[PDB]
Amino acid sequence: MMEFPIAVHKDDGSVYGVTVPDIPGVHSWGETIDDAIKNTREAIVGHVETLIELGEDVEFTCSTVEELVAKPEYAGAVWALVSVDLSQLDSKPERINVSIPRFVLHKIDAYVASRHETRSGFLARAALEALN
Amino acid sequence: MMEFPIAVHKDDGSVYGVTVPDIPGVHSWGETIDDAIKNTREAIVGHVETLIELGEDVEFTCSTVEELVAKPEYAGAVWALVSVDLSQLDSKPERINVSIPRFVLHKIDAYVASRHETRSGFLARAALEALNEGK
Amino acid sequence: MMEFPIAVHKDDGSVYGVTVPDIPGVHSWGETIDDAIKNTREAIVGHVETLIELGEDVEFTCSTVEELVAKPEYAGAVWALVSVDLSQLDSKPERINVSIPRFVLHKIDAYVASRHETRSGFLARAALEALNEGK
Amino acid sequence: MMEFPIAVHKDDGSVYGVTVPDIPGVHSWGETIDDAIKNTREAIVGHVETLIELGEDVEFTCSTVEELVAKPEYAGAVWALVSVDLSQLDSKPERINVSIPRFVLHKIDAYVASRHETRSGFLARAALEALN
Numbered sequence A, D: 001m002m003e004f005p006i007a008v009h010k011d012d013g014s015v016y017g018v019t020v021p022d023i024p025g026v027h028s029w030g031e032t033i034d035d036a037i038k039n040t041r042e043a044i045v046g047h048v049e050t051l052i053e054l055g056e057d058v059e060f061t062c063s064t065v066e067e068l069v070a071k072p073e074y075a076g077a078v079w080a081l082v083s084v085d086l087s088q089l090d091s092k093p094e095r096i097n098v099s100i101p102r103f104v105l106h107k108i109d110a111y112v113a114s115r116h117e118t119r120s121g122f123l124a125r126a127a128l129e130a131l132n
Numbered sequence B, C: 001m002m003e004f005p006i007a008v009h010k011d012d013g014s015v016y017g018v019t020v021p022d023i024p025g026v027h028s029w030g031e032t033i034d035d036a037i038k039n040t041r042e043a044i045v046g047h048v049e050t051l052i053e054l055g056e057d058v059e060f061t062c063s064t065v066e067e068l069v070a071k072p073e074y075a076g077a078v079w080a081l082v083s084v085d086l087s088q089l090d091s092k093p094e095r096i097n098v099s100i101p102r103f104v105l106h107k108i109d110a111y112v113a114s115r116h117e118t119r120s121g122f123l124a125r126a127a128l129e130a131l132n133e134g135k
């Protein structure tokens, strides 16, 4: 699960505006903060899916709120985190047959059992993670 | 049916280390003697299972407690025998079906084709990296 | 699909606690903001899954961030929305097949006999007590 | 998995003798220390299986080496631990259908995955443990 920090600003007349520190160029908005979060999620997912559909490598780096919160350009922002999982990206994953040593599977099984994760989800995230 | 002798010894306060004479590379321990034995059994079982799964033969003759009990490197040791049954162990890694996002499978398959790796060996290694980083 | 607002606040040094306004009894935390959210997501999913499995109706209307964002107890909070899909949740506990030595299954059945307990509720409770030995 | 401490004594004009602190009455022996350990394991297993077959409750109280080693009656002993688990007792376990809440199963699954244990083994040991 990836967590994108998003910076929410609001004034008296204008609506909620949102910027995405890890994706300059994305600017979203909402009549309420909940709508702004949801609209920013859609903009982030559409961005990532679009670059994939274009044939581009996409490198999944997320900043943390901790590291951005004291920066002046984010003074007075309301911080939120939008959760993006890889299932949220590809609608038609491919089922493949692979062999994994049992001592590795036992470590995967112990780990995913406490997190509502699967062998498949763990391996897909591990595959992506090793590629960076 | 292999019988691995193991030797538990006191190292510091409330930490018991274990020697496995027939697998010198295994270094298990426990906060209690019983924990140390249970942890060593798990290391030995995983070792034997994993080498058999590589297609190796692991049938050698274990040491006896008798030939080791009087050696001075085992003074004060607490002994146990770990019994390992090889009859049910598979000689190849476990085959599983998994679901992978296509764009991820693409950059796997393109990656392994160049170093002549396998998807399996790639995902196995990738899994171990992800497990170790989480700490 | 249920959208639970969660509020992450920095409680002490290097520890972030989380409030779930619609489940006041859940008190999750994490070493980082991201870990706090992931731990909170897991407690919320487990909560909703477990109550539906008890045969309860859990569909109610979640709070919004909007109605909470300006309240003093949430000053400085970092917000997130945890999305819970109820579609796949089963309304009964998981049925499993297990192998039990007869002499223990005798001393289970004889014991649940006049407590008006079930084998299931007994094994569930015994499992949890046994797990409560966390090192 | 149960671990019975056993005390091994050896004098030259004789063989290895063994006593079992948690089972007074058991006295075993062997030409070698390995034979004496194996013979003591059989006597312990036979003892427990025999009481069960007599219809007696059996309560698994194992001492630890740590708490026995300094007692004067065990001065100069060589200590070993005899491992007994419940499968080593009943030859014909019964297969039953039960319902377990998933949050309990997930905790069982995480625990047993690192130990070569099963849901069934864990629940049988738990059934015996919280049953006192």
Ligand SMILES: [Cl-]
Residues within 6 Å of the ligand: A116, A117, A118, A120, A121, A122
């Ligand atoms: Cl997953």
Ligand SMILES: [Cl-]
Residues within 6 Å of the ligand: A118, A119, A120, A121, B097, B098, B099
């Ligand atoms: Cl899977």
Ligand SMILES: [Cl-]
Residues within 6 Å of the ligand: D116, D117, D118, D120, D121, D122
């Ligand atoms: Cl087991």
Ligand SMILES: [Cl-]
Residues within 6 Å of the ligand: C097, C098, C099, D118, D119, D120, D121
């Ligand atoms: Cl099982």
